[PDB]
A and B are shown apart, each in its own frame.
Chain A
Amino acid sequence: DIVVTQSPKFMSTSAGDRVSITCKARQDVGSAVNWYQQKPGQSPKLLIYRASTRHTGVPDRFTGSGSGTDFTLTISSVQSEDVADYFCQQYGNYDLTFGAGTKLELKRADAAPTVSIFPPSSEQLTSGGASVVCFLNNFYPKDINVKWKIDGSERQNGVLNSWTDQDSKDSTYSMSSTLTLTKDEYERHNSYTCEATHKTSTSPIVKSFNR
Chain B
Amino acid sequence: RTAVRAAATERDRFYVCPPPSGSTVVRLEPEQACDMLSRIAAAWCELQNKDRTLWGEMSRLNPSAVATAALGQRVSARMLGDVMAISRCVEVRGGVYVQNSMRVPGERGTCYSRPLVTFEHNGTGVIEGQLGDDNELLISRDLIEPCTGNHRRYFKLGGGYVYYEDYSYVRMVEVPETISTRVTLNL
Please give the residue numbers on chain A whose beta carbons come within 8 Å of chain B beta carbons, in ascending order. 28-32, 50, 91-94
- What separation, in Å, do the CA atoms of A50 and B166 have in the docked complex? 11
Does B149 count as interface, using CB distance less than 8 angstroms?
A: yes
A-B contact pairs, 7 of them (CB 8 A): A29-B149, A29-B150, A31-B149, A31-B150, A32-B149, A92-B149, A92-B150
- What separation, in Å, do the CA atoms of A50 and B146 have in the docked complex? 17
- Please give me the 5 A-B residue pairs with the lowest Cβ-Cβ distance, nearest first: A32-B149, A32-B150, A30-B150, A91-B149, A92-B150
Residue in B146, B148, B150, B152 with the greatest tally of chain A CB atoms within 10 Å: B150
Chain B interface main SS type: loop
Q: Output the least CB separation between A88 and chain B (Å).
A: 13
Q: Output the least CB separation between B147 and chain A (Å).
A: 9
Q: Which of B146, B150, B152 contacts A94 (CB 8 A)?
A: B146
Residues of B within 8 A of A28 (CB): 150
- What separation, in Å, do the CA atoms of A30 and B146 have in the docked complex? 18
Nearest B residue (CB) for A29: B150
Q: Give the interface size bracket for B toward A.
A: under 10
Q: Output the least CB separation between B167 and chain A (Å).
A: 12
Chain A interface main SS type: loop
- What separation, in Å, do the CA atoms of A94 and B152 have in the docked complex? 16
- What separation, in Å, do the CA atoms of A29 and B150 have in the docked complex? 7
Nearest A residue (CB) for B152: A30
Residues of B within 8 A of A31 (CB): 149-150
- What separation, in Å, do the CA atoms of A60 and B97 have in the docked complex? 43
16 new A-B contacts at CB < 8 Å, known A28-B150, A30-B152, A92-B149:
A29-B149, A29-B150, A30-B150, A31-B149, A31-B150, A32-B148, A32-B149, A32-B150, A50-B149, A91-B148, A91-B149, A92-B148, A92-B150, A93-B148, A94-B146, A94-B148
Residues of A within 8 A of B149 (CB): 29, 31-32, 50, 91-92
Residues of A within 8 A of B150 (CB): 28-32, 92
- What separation, in Å, do the CA atoms of A32 and B146 have in the docked complex? 15
Interface residues of B in 90-120 (CB under 8 A from A): none
Q: Output the least CB separation between A85 and chain B (Å).
A: 23
> Interface readout for B145-186 with A: 1 if CB under 8 Å, 0 if not?
010111010000000000000000000000000000000000
Residues of B within 8 A of A93 (CB): 148
Residues of B within 8 A of A92 (CB): 148-150
- What separation, in Å, do the CA atoms of A111 and B148 have in the docked complex? 49
Residues of A within 8 A of B146 (CB): 94
Nearest B residue (CB) for A30: B150
- What separation, in Å, do the CA atoms of A87 and B146 have in the docked complex? 23
- What separation, in Å, do the CA atoms of A28 and B151 have in the docked complex? 12
- What separation, in Å, do the CA atoms of A31 and B146 have in the docked complex? 17
- What separation, in Å, do the CA atoms of A28 and B149 have in the docked complex? 11
Q: Output the least CB separation between B57 and chain A (Å).
A: 30
Q: Output the least CB separation between A118 and chain B (Å).
A: 54
Q: Output the least CB separation between A29 and chain B (Å).
A: 6
Nearest A residue (CB) for B146: A94
Q: Output the least CB separation between A76 and chain B (Å).
A: 26
